[PDB]
């Protein structure tokens, strides 16, 4: 079961893109996606009908188009991402304003039109002589196995517009950074001003994980997905550089597409059970310093079948305003559970699980539990240390009665 349905809409600036990118589309079709190809400017385009989403995934391979046909608009795409749809965007030097605006909403800042990434040291030998076709080293690749694939990759060719991730937005993912020497500027015009992107700040590919878990990937270069790069060999122009039979573009593209479409890293939270130790049911309210058992189950989507999750870093918290207790949840019997003693302070406590990890879906669970003070009956009785006090009160009654008997009949 795929978290996102196979229905996919493809937007192409020109029909020829399908032929040039046949390898990418064929690999996607082989996975069971139902692709439909329409021109980006086509008037009939629509995403929402009567409040329902016509398509589950959108791929915009329309870098040069100034405006979208029909009802598609930057607001509509933003709503679509909020709905949980996955979006893929491919850019180029001809980027129109809507693509830049869409990146702005997502926190990824595209550079101005006509700019290109310039690398004078790592540009491929095949480059036209403008040093804009850069051989991106795998070292810059993000250290996330789920997103990029466990397998190693050969150097990948990128040619396109650099973008900068906004620092303020935490969710932004720096999937592929540029080289230390790379920068984004207008090649013809001298660099009087500070570059928009300089050094490793420049981003070639970046990803976003929304709070609703929608995933969007922005690529600086449309050509990266082109069949030409996939088959072309790579050798750096600089002397002493090895020549590789094939690029890593094809392998990297396959891994990214799987991540965007919720084929990897998807996690679900099942029932959570809490009860007093030795009890099968949760009490209405717990007592101070009582011992309780907390159990939760988490699953992972592998190959479309849910299986027990293997994560070992999960941490449970008992919180009132700030976390009183935090501990790891042990993996026992296919479930994550721990037993602990409640704090000595009463209040409206909440159990919390916040297992957020890079590349995986963000899981949050909260259950409200009230802890109450001890009842009057529960207090200790017949304390041995208090025996002298006990003796006095009993003694007084006996003396008083004896006095009454003697006094009356004296």
């Amino acid at each position: 079961v795929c978290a996102s349905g196979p229905r996919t809409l493809v937007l192409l600036d020109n029909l020829n893109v399908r032929e040039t990118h046949s390898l990418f589309f064929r690999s996607l079709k082989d996975r069971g996606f139902e692709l439909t190809f329409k021109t980006a400017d086509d008037p009939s385009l629509s995403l929402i009908k009567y409040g329902e989403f016509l398509y589950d995934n959108l791929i915009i391979f329309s870098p040069s188009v100034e405006d979208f046909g029909g009802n598609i608009n930057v607001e509509t795409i933003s709503a679509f991402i909020d709905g949980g749809g996955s979006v893929l965007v491919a850019a180029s030097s001809d980027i129109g304003d809507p693509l830049r605006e869409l990146g702005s909403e997502c926190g990824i800042e595209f550079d101005e039109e006509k700019t290109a990434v310039i690398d004078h040291h790592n540009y491929d030998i095949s480059d036209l002589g403008q040093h804009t076709l850069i051989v991106a080293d795998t070292e810059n690749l993000l250290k996330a196995p789920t997103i990029v694939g466990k397998s190693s990759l050969n150097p990948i060719l990128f040619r396109g517009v650099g973008m900068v991730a906004d620092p303020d937005n935490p969710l932004v993912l720096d999937i592929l950074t540029g080289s230390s020497t790379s920068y984004s500027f207008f090649p013809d015009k001298p660099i009087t001003q500070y570059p928009h992107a300089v050094g490793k700040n420049t981003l070639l590919i970046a990803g976003l994980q929304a709070r609703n878990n929608a995933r969007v990937i922005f690529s600086g270069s449309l050509d990266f997905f082109s069949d030409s790069f996939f088959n072309s060999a790579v050798q750096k122009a600089a002397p002493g550089s090895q020549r590789y039979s094939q690029t890593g573009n094809y392998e990297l593209a396959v891994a990214l597409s799987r991540w965007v479409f919720k084929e990897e890293g998807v996690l679900r939270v099942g029932p959570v059970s809490h009860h007093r130790v030795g009890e099968t049911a949760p009490p209405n309210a717990y007592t101070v310093t009582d011992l309780v058992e907390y159990s939760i189950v988490i699953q992972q989507l592998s190959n479309g079948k849910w299986v027990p999750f293997d994560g070992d870093d999960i941490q449970l918290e008992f919180v009132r305003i700030d976390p009183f207790v935090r501990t790891f949840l042990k993996k026992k019997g296919g479930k994550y559970s721990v037993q602990f003693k409640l704090p000595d302070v009463y209040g409206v406590f909440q159990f919390k699980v916040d297992y957020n990890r890079l590349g995986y879906t963000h899981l949050y669970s909260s259950t409200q539990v009230s802890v109450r003070p001890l009842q009057h009956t529960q207090y200790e009785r017949f304390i041995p240390s208090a025996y002298p006090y006990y003796a006095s009160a009993f003694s007084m009654m006996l003396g008083l009665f004896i006095f009454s008997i003697v006094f009356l009949h004296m």
């Binding site: 309210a285 009132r320 009463y346 209040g347 409206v348 406590f349 009230s370 109450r372 003070p373 009057h376």
Partner: protein, 50 residues
């Protein structure tokens, strides 16, 4: 506040009312109703009602 307490005491009984802890107020700290109140007014109303 007195009205809500009076209803709880009559329906629930004195002993439960004595140990009543309310979690619906002063979130998230909570309040101990039993030990922070004056029972005189509530008891008189409940006794006549019975």
């Amino acid at each position: 506040f007195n009205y809500r307490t009076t209803r709880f005491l009559a329906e629930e009984g004195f002993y439960k009312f004595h140990n009543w802890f309310d979690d619906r107020a002063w979130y998230p700290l909570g309040r101990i109703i039993g030990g922070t109140i004056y029972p005189g007014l509530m008891i008189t109303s409940a006794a006549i009602y019975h």
